[PDB]
Protein backbone atom coordinates (compact mmCIF):
# COMPACT_ATOMS: atom_id res chain seq x y z
CA UNK A 1 0.00 0.00 0.00
CA UNK A 2 0.81 3.74 -0.05
CA UNK A 3 0.59 5.66 3.21
CA UNK A 4 2.30 8.97 2.51
CA UNK A 5 3.36 11.48 -0.14
CA UNK A 6 6.49 13.43 0.73
CA UNK A 7 8.28 16.56 -0.46
CA UNK A 8 5.32 18.19 -2.14
CA UNK A 9 4.58 21.82 -2.88
CA UNK A 10 1.02 23.11 -2.75
CA UNK A 11 -0.35 26.06 -4.75
CA UNK A 12 0.14 29.29 -2.79
CA UNK A 13 1.82 27.56 0.17
CA UNK A 14 5.28 27.97 1.69
CA UNK A 15 7.82 25.17 1.66
CA UNK A 16 7.24 21.44 1.42
CA UNK A 17 4.50 19.19 2.80
CA UNK A 18 3.62 15.59 3.57
CA UNK A 19 0.28 14.04 2.70
CA UNK A 20 -1.03 11.13 4.77
CA UNK A 21 -3.09 8.40 3.10
CA UNK A 22 -5.51 6.02 4.82
CA UNK A 23 -8.15 3.86 3.13
CA UNK A 24 -8.08 5.82 -0.13
CA UNK A 25 -8.61 9.15 1.61
CA UNK A 26 -6.47 12.02 2.76
CA UNK A 27 -6.13 11.82 6.54
CA UNK A 28 -3.71 14.68 7.10
CA UNK A 29 -1.51 17.26 5.45
CA UNK A 30 1.36 18.56 7.55
CA UNK A 31 4.15 21.03 6.83
CA UNK A 32 7.74 19.88 6.61
CA UNK A 33 10.88 21.27 8.24
CA UNK A 34 12.49 20.40 4.92
CA UNK A 35 13.40 17.63 2.49
CA UNK A 36 12.59 14.15 3.82
CA UNK A 37 14.32 10.79 3.15
CA UNK A 38 12.58 8.41 0.76
CA UNK A 39 10.86 5.69 2.79
CA UNK A 40 9.02 2.59 1.50
CA UNK A 41 5.23 2.98 1.29
CA UNK A 42 5.72 6.68 0.63
CA UNK A 43 5.69 8.25 -2.83
CA UNK A 44 8.33 10.91 -3.48
CA UNK A 45 6.96 14.12 -4.98
CA UNK A 46 10.57 15.32 -5.43
CA UNK A 47 9.51 18.90 -4.70
CA UNK A 48 6.96 18.78 -7.51
CA UNK A 49 3.54 20.40 -7.32
CA UNK A 50 0.52 18.51 -6.02
CA UNK A 51 -2.98 19.43 -7.18
CA UNK A 52 -6.26 17.61 -7.63
CA UNK A 53 -6.61 15.86 -10.99
CA UNK A 54 -7.25 17.64 -14.27
CA UNK A 55 -10.84 17.82 -15.42
CA UNK A 56 -12.03 17.76 -18.99
CA UNK A 57 -15.47 19.44 -18.89
CA UNK A 58 -16.18 19.24 -22.63
CA UNK A 59 -15.19 16.55 -25.10
CA UNK A 60 -16.94 14.45 -27.74
CA UNK A 61 -15.79 10.87 -27.21
CA UNK A 62 -18.19 9.46 -29.82
CA UNK A 63 -16.46 11.41 -32.64
CA UNK A 64 -12.91 11.10 -31.36
CA UNK A 65 -10.16 9.71 -33.62
CA UNK A 66 -12.20 9.72 -36.84
CA UNK A 67 -10.47 12.47 -38.83
CA UNK A 68 -10.55 11.89 -42.60
CA UNK A 69 -13.39 9.35 -42.70
CA UNK A 70 -15.26 9.33 -45.05
CA UNK A 71 -14.23 12.88 -46.02
CA UNK A 72 -12.36 15.92 -44.65
CA UNK A 73 -13.64 19.24 -43.31
CA UNK A 74 -12.33 21.23 -46.32
CA UNK A 75 -13.75 24.58 -45.24
CA UNK A 76 -12.93 23.97 -41.59
CA UNK A 77 -16.27 25.39 -40.33
CA UNK A 78 -18.53 24.39 -37.40
CA UNK A 79 -21.27 23.77 -40.00
CA UNK A 80 -19.18 21.54 -42.35
CA UNK A 81 -17.89 19.63 -39.33
CA UNK A 82 -21.59 18.75 -38.75
CA UNK A 83 -22.01 17.67 -42.43
CA UNK A 84 -18.90 15.42 -42.30
CA UNK A 85 -20.03 13.96 -38.95
CA UNK A 86 -23.46 13.00 -40.30
CA UNK A 87 -21.71 11.02 -43.08
CA UNK A 88 -19.48 9.24 -40.55
CA UNK A 89 -22.38 8.88 -38.09
CA UNK A 90 -24.02 6.57 -40.65
CA UNK A 91 -21.13 4.08 -40.22
CA UNK A 92 -21.09 3.98 -36.42
CA UNK A 93 -20.93 0.61 -34.80
CA UNK A 94 -20.97 -0.34 -31.14
CA UNK A 95 -17.40 -1.70 -31.42
CA UNK A 96 -16.08 1.26 -33.36
CA UNK A 97 -17.35 3.75 -30.78
CA UNK A 98 -15.94 1.83 -27.81
CA UNK A 99 -12.61 1.26 -29.51
CA UNK A 100 -12.04 4.97 -30.27
CA UNK A 101 -13.42 6.30 -26.98
CA UNK A 102 -11.12 3.98 -25.08
CA UNK A 103 -8.08 5.17 -26.99
CA UNK A 104 -8.68 8.83 -26.13
CA UNK A 105 -9.67 7.88 -22.60
CA UNK A 106 -6.27 6.20 -22.23
CA UNK A 107 -4.47 9.35 -23.36
CA UNK A 108 -6.51 11.22 -20.79
CA UNK A 109 -5.47 8.96 -17.91
CA UNK A 110 -1.84 9.34 -19.06
CA UNK A 111 -2.38 13.12 -18.81
CA UNK A 112 -3.69 13.20 -15.26
CA UNK A 113 -7.37 13.58 -16.09
CA UNK A 114 -9.65 11.74 -13.66
CA UNK A 115 -12.92 13.52 -14.44
CA UNK A 116 -14.46 13.80 -17.91
CA UNK A 117 -17.77 15.02 -19.36
CA UNK A 118 -18.44 13.72 -22.86
CA UNK A 119 -21.22 14.86 -25.16
CA UNK A 120 -22.81 12.07 -27.17
CA UNK A 121 -24.89 12.74 -30.27
CA UNK A 122 -28.41 11.47 -29.64
CA UNK A 123 -29.86 12.56 -32.96
CA UNK A 124 -30.02 8.91 -33.91
CA UNK A 125 -33.04 6.60 -33.78
CA UNK A 126 -30.78 3.70 -32.74
CA UNK A 127 -28.83 5.57 -30.02
CA UNK A 128 -25.86 3.32 -30.89
CA UNK A 129 -23.19 5.68 -29.53
CA UNK A 130 -25.09 6.64 -26.40
CA UNK A 131 -25.74 3.03 -25.45
CA UNK A 132 -22.11 2.06 -26.19
CA UNK A 133 -20.85 5.04 -24.21
CA UNK A 134 -23.01 4.08 -21.20
CA UNK A 135 -20.98 0.85 -21.11
CA UNK A 136 -17.62 2.66 -21.44
CA UNK A 137 -18.68 4.72 -18.42
CA UNK A 138 -18.88 1.55 -16.26
CA UNK A 139 -15.78 0.03 -17.85
CA UNK A 140 -13.56 3.07 -17.21
CA UNK A 141 -14.96 3.98 -13.75
CA UNK A 142 -11.93 2.74 -11.81
CA UNK A 143 -9.67 5.36 -13.44
CA UNK A 144 -12.04 8.15 -14.59
CA UNK A 145 -15.49 9.36 -13.48
CA UNK A 146 -17.29 9.88 -16.81
CA UNK A 147 -20.39 12.08 -17.16
CA UNK A 148 -22.49 11.60 -20.31
CA UNK A 149 -24.45 14.42 -21.92
CA UNK A 150 -27.34 13.51 -24.17
CA UNK A 151 -26.46 15.93 -26.95
CA UNK A 152 -29.10 16.52 -29.67
CA UNK A 153 -26.55 17.41 -32.33
CA UNK A 154 -29.17 18.06 -35.03
CA UNK A 155 -31.68 19.89 -32.87
CA UNK A 156 -34.53 19.01 -30.55
CA UNK A 157 -37.37 20.59 -32.54
CA UNK A 158 -35.52 20.48 -35.87
CA UNK A 159 -34.88 16.76 -35.94
CA UNK A 160 -37.61 14.12 -36.47
CA UNK A 161 -38.42 12.79 -32.98
CA UNK A 162 -35.53 14.63 -31.35
CA UNK A 163 -37.42 15.40 -28.17
CA UNK A 164 -38.43 11.73 -27.78
CA UNK A 165 -34.88 10.57 -28.48
CA UNK A 166 -33.40 12.98 -25.96
CA UNK A 167 -35.79 11.68 -23.31
CA UNK A 168 -35.08 8.02 -24.05
CA UNK A 169 -31.37 8.83 -23.63
CA UNK A 170 -32.12 10.14 -20.12
CA UNK A 171 -34.25 7.08 -19.34
CA UNK A 172 -31.23 4.93 -20.28
CA UNK A 173 -29.08 6.95 -17.89
CA UNK A 174 -27.39 10.01 -19.42
CA UNK A 175 -26.18 12.23 -16.56
CA UNK A 176 -26.67 15.56 -18.33
CA UNK A 177 -29.24 17.01 -20.71
CA UNK A 178 -27.89 18.94 -23.72
CA UNK A 179 -29.29 21.36 -26.30
CA UNK A 180 -28.10 23.42 -29.26
CA UNK A 181 -30.54 26.33 -29.74
CA UNK A 182 -28.55 28.36 -32.33
CA UNK A 183 -28.66 25.37 -34.72
CA UNK A 184 -32.47 25.03 -34.53
CA UNK A 185 -34.30 26.22 -37.64
CA UNK A 186 -35.70 29.35 -36.03
CA UNK A 187 -35.15 31.62 -33.09
CA UNK A 188 -38.48 30.57 -31.61
CA UNK A 189 -37.50 26.90 -31.84
CA UNK A 190 -34.24 27.71 -30.14
CA UNK A 191 -35.94 29.39 -27.23
CA UNK A 192 -38.54 26.62 -26.83
CA UNK A 193 -35.96 23.87 -27.09
CA UNK A 194 -34.55 25.32 -23.86
CA UNK A 195 -37.90 25.08 -22.07
CA UNK A 196 -38.08 21.42 -23.04
CA UNK A 197 -34.48 20.72 -22.00
CA UNK A 198 -35.11 22.30 -18.61
CA UNK A 199 -38.38 20.41 -18.10
CA UNK A 200 -36.54 17.15 -18.88
CA UNK A 201 -33.74 17.99 -16.43
CA UNK A 202 -36.27 18.66 -13.63
CA UNK A 203 -38.30 15.55 -14.45
CA UNK A 204 -35.21 13.29 -14.15
CA UNK A 205 -33.11 15.25 -11.63
CA UNK A 206 -30.24 15.72 -14.11
CA UNK A 207 -27.66 18.40 -14.84
CA UNK A 208 -27.83 20.66 -17.88
CA UNK A 209 -25.18 21.51 -20.49
CA UNK A 210 -26.02 23.55 -23.59
CA UNK A 211 -23.94 24.21 -26.75
CA UNK A 212 -24.85 27.83 -26.43
CA UNK A 213 -24.41 30.41 -29.20
CA UNK A 214 -21.40 28.70 -30.81
CA UNK A 215 -21.51 31.11 -33.76
CA UNK A 216 -20.16 34.52 -34.81
CA UNK A 217 -23.62 36.11 -34.71
CA UNK A 218 -24.17 39.03 -32.35
CA UNK A 219 -27.90 38.30 -32.44
CA UNK A 220 -27.41 34.77 -31.11
CA UNK A 221 -28.53 35.43 -27.53
CA UNK A 222 -29.77 32.08 -26.18
CA UNK A 223 -27.49 32.29 -23.17
CA UNK A 224 -29.91 34.76 -21.54
CA UNK A 225 -32.67 32.16 -21.63
CA UNK A 226 -30.39 29.51 -20.19
CA UNK A 227 -29.53 31.86 -17.34
CA UNK A 228 -33.15 33.02 -16.80
CA UNK A 229 -34.53 29.44 -16.70
CA UNK A 230 -31.81 28.31 -14.29
CA UNK A 231 -32.52 31.25 -12.00
CA UNK A 232 -36.26 30.64 -12.07
CA UNK A 233 -35.73 26.99 -11.09
CA UNK A 234 -33.07 27.77 -8.49
CA UNK A 235 -30.82 25.25 -10.22
CA UNK A 236 -27.83 27.51 -11.03
CA UNK A 237 -24.93 25.26 -10.04
CA UNK A 238 -26.41 22.37 -12.09
CA UNK A 239 -26.33 24.41 -15.31
CA UNK A 240 -23.52 24.94 -17.84
CA UNK A 241 -23.43 27.01 -21.03
CA UNK A 242 -20.70 25.75 -23.42
CA UNK A 243 -18.85 27.92 -25.96
CA UNK A 244 -21.00 31.08 -25.93
CA UNK A 245 -18.58 32.33 -28.62
CA UNK A 246 -21.27 34.76 -29.90
CA UNK A 247 -20.54 36.76 -26.74
CA UNK A 248 -17.17 37.65 -28.24
CA UNK A 249 -19.11 39.79 -30.73
CA UNK A 250 -21.81 41.28 -28.47
CA UNK A 251 -21.95 45.04 -28.04
CA UNK A 252 -20.70 46.09 -24.62
CA UNK A 253 -23.92 47.67 -23.29
CA UNK A 254 -25.89 44.46 -23.65
CA UNK A 255 -23.03 42.35 -22.27
CA UNK A 256 -22.95 44.47 -19.14
CA UNK A 257 -26.72 44.07 -18.75
CA UNK A 258 -26.40 40.33 -19.33
CA UNK A 259 -23.57 39.88 -16.79
CA UNK A 260 -25.88 40.99 -13.94
CA UNK A 261 -28.09 37.97 -14.70
CA UNK A 262 -25.18 35.56 -15.26
CA UNK A 263 -23.83 36.37 -11.84
CA UNK A 264 -27.29 35.98 -10.20
CA UNK A 265 -28.09 32.70 -11.88
CA UNK A 266 -24.80 31.11 -10.85
CA UNK A 267 -24.50 29.07 -14.05
CA UNK A 268 -21.18 27.77 -15.39
CA UNK A 269 -19.26 28.48 -18.60
CA UNK A 270 -16.90 26.40 -20.70
CA UNK A 271 -14.65 27.90 -23.30
CA UNK A 272 -12.84 25.63 -25.78
CA UNK A 273 -9.72 27.58 -27.02
CA UNK A 274 -8.06 24.98 -29.28
CA UNK A 275 -11.26 24.58 -31.25
CA UNK A 276 -12.70 28.10 -30.91
CA UNK A 277 -9.59 29.70 -32.49
CA UNK A 278 -9.68 27.17 -35.29
CA UNK A 279 -13.40 27.40 -36.19
CA UNK A 280 -14.42 30.96 -35.29
CA UNK A 281 -13.58 33.93 -37.52
CA UNK A 282 -14.06 31.71 -40.57
CA UNK A 283 -16.57 34.17 -42.07
CA UNK A 284 -14.32 37.15 -41.48
CA UNK A 285 -11.66 38.15 -43.96
CA UNK A 286 -9.35 40.78 -42.51
CA UNK A 287 -9.35 41.75 -39.81
CA UNK A 288 -10.35 38.42 -38.27
CA UNK A 289 -11.92 37.99 -34.83
CA UNK A 290 -10.55 35.68 -32.13
CA UNK A 291 -13.94 34.16 -31.24
CA UNK A 292 -13.47 32.94 -27.64
CA UNK A 293 -16.17 33.81 -25.08
CA UNK A 294 -15.46 36.62 -22.59
CA UNK A 295 -13.20 34.65 -20.22
CA UNK A 296 -11.24 37.58 -18.78
CA UNK A 297 -14.37 39.57 -17.85
CA UNK A 298 -16.04 36.51 -16.34
CA UNK A 299 -13.04 35.92 -14.08
CA UNK A 300 -13.14 39.58 -12.95
CA UNK A 301 -16.87 39.27 -12.18
CA UNK A 302 -16.56 35.93 -10.36
CA UNK A 303 -18.60 34.02 -12.89
CA UNK A 304 -17.36 30.44 -13.00
CA UNK A 305 -15.65 29.71 -16.35
CA UNK A 306 -13.28 26.90 -17.35
CA UNK A 307 -11.53 25.31 -20.36
CA UNK A 308 -12.38 22.21 -22.35
CA UNK A 309 -10.58 20.47 -25.22
CA UNK A 310 -13.89 19.77 -27.04
CA UNK A 311 -12.53 17.63 -29.92
CA UNK A 312 -9.56 15.25 -30.17
CA UNK A 313 -8.53 14.28 -33.71
CA UNK A 314 -11.85 14.40 -35.59
CA UNK A 315 -13.69 16.39 -38.37
CA UNK A 316 -13.90 19.55 -36.25
CA UNK A 317 -10.28 19.36 -35.01
CA UNK A 318 -7.39 17.43 -36.62
CA UNK A 319 -4.95 17.61 -33.68
CA UNK A 320 -4.69 16.89 -29.96
CA UNK A 321 -3.34 14.48 -27.38
CA UNK A 322 -6.03 15.29 -24.77
CA UNK A 323 -3.55 17.55 -22.93
CA UNK A 324 -5.10 20.12 -20.60
CA UNK A 325 -1.96 22.26 -20.09
CA UNK A 326 -1.82 22.67 -23.85
CA UNK A 327 -5.47 23.83 -23.83
CA UNK A 328 -4.74 26.21 -20.96
CA UNK A 329 -1.74 27.46 -22.88
CA UNK A 330 -3.78 28.39 -25.96
CA UNK A 331 -6.45 29.94 -23.72
CA UNK A 332 -4.14 32.33 -21.88
CA UNK A 333 -2.70 33.51 -25.18
CA UNK A 334 -5.88 34.01 -27.09
CA UNK A 335 -7.72 35.53 -24.11
CA UNK A 336 -4.70 37.71 -23.30
CA UNK A 337 -4.48 36.48 -19.70
CA UNK A 338 -0.71 36.96 -19.75
CA UNK A 339 0.18 38.61 -16.43
CA UNK A 340 2.25 36.52 -13.99
CA UNK A 341 -0.63 36.25 -11.53
CA UNK A 342 -3.04 35.34 -14.30
CA UNK A 343 -0.85 32.62 -15.76
CA UNK A 344 -0.12 31.10 -12.37
CA UNK A 345 -3.83 30.98 -11.45
CA UNK A 346 -4.45 29.45 -14.85
CA UNK A 347 -4.43 25.98 -13.30
CA UNK A 348 -7.80 26.69 -11.69
CA UNK A 349 -9.21 26.83 -15.21
CA UNK A 350 -8.46 23.16 -15.76
CA UNK A 351 -8.88 22.02 -12.11
CA UNK A 352 -11.13 23.73 -9.54
CA UNK A 353 -13.41 25.69 -11.91
CA UNK A 354 -13.98 22.63 -14.05
CA UNK A 355 -14.84 20.55 -10.98
CA UNK A 356 -17.36 23.21 -10.01
CA UNK A 357 -18.77 22.90 -13.56
CA UNK A 358 -19.18 19.12 -13.42
CA UNK A 359 -20.76 19.62 -9.98
CA UNK A 360 -18.25 17.46 -8.11
CA UNK A 361 -18.31 17.15 -4.30
CA UNK A 362 -15.33 14.92 -3.62
CA UNK A 363 -12.68 17.23 -5.08
CA UNK A 364 -9.55 18.93 -3.80
CA UNK A 365 -6.43 18.20 -1.80
CA UNK A 366 -7.94 18.33 1.71
CA UNK A 367 -8.35 15.85 4.57
CA UNK A 368 -11.47 13.69 4.19
CA UNK A 369 -11.56 13.79 0.40
CA UNK A 370 -10.55 10.74 -1.59
CA UNK A 371 -6.84 10.40 -2.36
CA UNK A 372 -7.33 11.57 -5.95
CA UNK A 373 -4.42 13.74 -7.03
CA UNK A 374 -1.63 14.33 -9.50
CA UNK A 375 1.98 15.45 -9.18
CA UNK A 376 3.63 17.75 -11.70
CA UNK A 377 7.39 18.01 -12.08
CA UNK A 378 7.24 21.78 -11.53
CA UNK A 379 7.54 24.57 -8.93
CA UNK A 380 4.17 26.24 -9.53
CA UNK A 381 1.36 26.79 -12.03
CA UNK A 382 3.43 29.24 -14.04
CA UNK A 383 6.40 26.92 -14.35
CA UNK A 384 4.24 23.94 -15.38
CA UNK A 385 2.35 25.99 -17.92
CA UNK A 386 5.53 27.54 -19.33
CA UNK A 387 7.37 24.24 -19.71
CA UNK A 388 4.38 22.14 -20.78
CA UNK A 389 5.38 19.51 -18.25
CA UNK A 390 3.89 15.99 -18.39
CA UNK A 391 2.27 14.40 -15.31
CA UNK A 392 4.76 12.75 -12.98
CA UNK A 393 2.28 10.66 -10.96
CA UNK A 394 -1.46 10.17 -11.07
CA UNK A 395 -2.89 8.87 -7.82
CA UNK A 396 -6.47 7.60 -7.61
CA UNK A 397 -8.06 6.40 -4.37
CA UNK A 398 -4.57 6.04 -2.95
CA UNK A 399 -3.08 4.09 -5.85
CA UNK A 400 -0.77 5.15 -8.69
CA UNK A 401 -2.74 4.71 -11.91
CA UNK A 402 -0.14 6.33 -14.18
CA UNK A 403 3.41 7.67 -14.13
CA UNK A 404 5.68 9.52 -16.58
CA UNK A 405 9.44 9.11 -16.65
CA UNK A 406 10.56 12.61 -17.72
CA UNK A 407 12.46 13.17 -20.95
CA UNK A 408 16.15 13.95 -20.56
CA UNK A 409 17.95 16.39 -22.79
CA UNK A 410 21.67 16.74 -23.06
CA UNK A 411 23.77 19.22 -24.99
CA UNK A 412 27.37 18.38 -25.89
CA UNK A 413 29.38 21.57 -25.55
CA UNK A 414 32.95 21.48 -24.25
CA UNK A 415 31.51 18.87 -21.93
CA UNK A 416 28.06 17.25 -21.63
CA UNK A 417 25.29 19.34 -19.99
CA UNK A 418 21.77 18.60 -18.76
CA UNK A 419 19.10 21.04 -19.97
CA UNK A 420 15.98 21.54 -17.87
CA UNK A 421 14.84 24.91 -19.29
CA UNK A 422 14.81 26.87 -16.01
Ligand SMILES: C[C@H](O)COCC(COC[C@@H](C)O)(COC[C@@H](C)O)COC[C@@H](C)O
Pocket residue numbers: 095096098099100102103106139
Ligand atom coordinates in the same frame (compact mmCIF):
# COMPACT_ATOMS: atom_id res chain seq x y z
C1 LIG B 1 -8.43 1.07 -27.81
C2 LIG B 1 -7.41 0.33 -26.99
O1 LIG B 1 -6.25 1.05 -26.73
C3 LIG B 1 -7.99 -0.42 -25.80
O2 LIG B 1 -8.90 -1.48 -26.03
C4 LIG B 1 -9.15 -2.41 -25.01
C5 LIG B 1 -10.48 -2.31 -24.29
C6 LIG B 1 -11.02 -3.69 -23.94
O3 LIG B 1 -12.26 -3.76 -23.28
C7 LIG B 1 -12.29 -3.49 -21.90
C8 LIG B 1 -13.32 -4.22 -21.07
C9 LIG B 1 -13.20 -3.93 -19.59
O4 LIG B 1 -13.43 -5.56 -21.38
C10 LIG B 1 -10.19 -1.50 -23.05
O5 LIG B 1 -8.90 -1.72 -22.60
C11 LIG B 1 -8.57 -1.26 -21.32
C12 LIG B 1 -8.17 -2.30 -20.32
C13 LIG B 1 -6.70 -2.71 -20.40
O6 LIG B 1 -8.63 -1.94 -19.07
C14 LIG B 1 -11.49 -1.59 -25.17
O7 LIG B 1 -11.65 -2.14 -26.44
C15 LIG B 1 -12.90 -2.06 -27.04
C16 LIG B 1 -13.44 -3.35 -27.61
C17 LIG B 1 -13.90 -4.35 -26.56
O8 LIG B 1 -14.27 -3.10 -28.69
Ligand SMILES: Nc1nc(=O)[nH]c2nc[nH]c12
Pocket residue numbers: 060063078153211214275310311316
Ligand atom coordinates in the same frame (compact mmCIF):
# COMPACT_ATOMS: atom_id res chain seq x y z
N1 LIG C 1 -17.37 22.09 -31.77
C1 LIG C 1 -18.37 21.35 -31.97
N2 LIG C 1 -19.62 21.84 -32.23
C2 LIG C 1 -20.69 21.01 -32.45
O1 LIG C 1 -21.83 21.50 -32.69
N3 LIG C 1 -20.60 19.66 -32.42
C3 LIG C 1 -19.42 19.05 -32.16
N4 LIG C 1 -19.02 17.78 -32.07
C4 LIG C 1 -17.69 17.77 -31.78
N5 LIG C 1 -17.20 19.03 -31.69
C5 LIG C 1 -18.22 19.88 -31.92
Ligand SMILES: [Zn+2]
Pocket residue numbers: 094132135
Ligand atom coordinates in the same frame (compact mmCIF):
# COMPACT_ATOMS: atom_id res chain seq x y z
ZN1 LIG D 1 -22.27 -3.67 -25.61
Ligand SMILES: [Zn+2]
Pocket residue numbers: 058059060119211310
Ligand atom coordinates in the same frame (compact mmCIF):
# COMPACT_ATOMS: atom_id res chain seq x y z
ZN1 LIG E 1 -19.00 20.29 -28.04
